[PDB]
Structure formats: C-alpha cells, structure tokens
Amino acid sequence: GLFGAIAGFIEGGWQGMVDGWYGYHHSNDQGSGYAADKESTQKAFDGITNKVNSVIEKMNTQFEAVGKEFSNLERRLENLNKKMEDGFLDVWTYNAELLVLMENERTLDFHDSNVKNLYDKVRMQLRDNVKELGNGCFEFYHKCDDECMNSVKNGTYDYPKYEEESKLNRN
C-alpha cells in the first residue's frame, strides 16, 4: 500500500499462516512449511498493543457536566451552558474520530513496512545465492536443509559456505 509489500509484490495472504502475522514458507526436499517469524510478529504485537493502550489512556478525564437547570429569565445563561457543552462535545468527537482515522492508516502502513523490512532482511542476508523472483519468494542455487532454512529464519546464514557451490550451479 505505501511500502508495497502487502497487496503488492507479495500479492495475497497465507490462510495457512496462523501461528503469527508474518513469516516464511520453505519448500525443500525434506518438506514444506508455513512457519511464522518470531521477532517481527512479536515486535508488531508489542507496538500495536502499546498503541491502543496509548489511545484508551488519552481520553480518560472526568467528572459529570454537573447538570444545571435555568429560569425563563436566564435564557442566555442556559444557552451559554448548552453552547459550551455541545462545543466540547464536537471537539472530543472530531478528536476521537480523526485519531481513529489517522492511527488506522499508520497501522496498516506499519504492517506493510514490517513485512517489507523482513523480506529485505532475508534478501540482504541470502545475497546472490538465490533468484529474487519477486512474488516475494527466493529460488536457491543450492541445497537448503530443514537446517539451512531454519538458520535463515533466525538470522544466521554462512554466505561464503554456499558461495562457491551456488556460483557453480548458477552458471
């Protein structure tokens, strides 16, 4: 949408990915596997909860309108009261709604940025041992085990291990 991962180059979602918000799908020999990233999904949960807690913590003052009654001889006073209550009312409506609209945008953009950033973490980690297809998947120039895979998803990838091997299979 703004970072173009969600509903972008990664065209659609993974109805089988249900252990988190974002993550991986490795398809080697040993098996397949929808498997959620930990770090990014957690950080995204911590951010959002922190956000809505920061929204319910911002509109919590008091107390009453104290509710007043006026004569048929103080109708300017009565209206002044009315004008000031409706007045504040409108302000707190606008404020609540605009906040809602804005933090909604920024929320969706946050997920988008989150996903992209992840794909950028994996891409810049792998480097040229792969084919950046651009459906959001990578095609390996070597054999990657349920062991080489599950080494990428926790940030550790010996590039110069598979360097020469993949250079060969590439050409």
Place this chain on the structure above:
Amino acid sequence: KVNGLGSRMEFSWTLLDMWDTINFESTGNLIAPEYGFKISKRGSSGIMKTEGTLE
C-alpha cells in the same frame, strides 16, 4: 385560582452556617419551618430527569 386558591405561598431558602444563628420574626404571614436539613453526606451526586423507576 390555581388548585382552587387565589392565595399564594412564596418560599425562600438558605444554608445556615455552622455555629450561626437564624432569626425568624414576624407580625404575620410567616410560614415558619419546624425542620432544618443538616448535610450528612457531601459528595458528587446529581439530579437525573427520567420518568422511569429503579430496578
């Protein structure tokens, strides 16, 4: 004639302060009080206008 009466009774009030004396004196027409209302529990309350009843 409201309520079958052409006469009126006009009431006024006050908050009598602690240790202060109120003084009534009249040569007529005084509807005096027999009671006073002490304030037993101050607190942020309210008056709600409803036709309904408490459940």
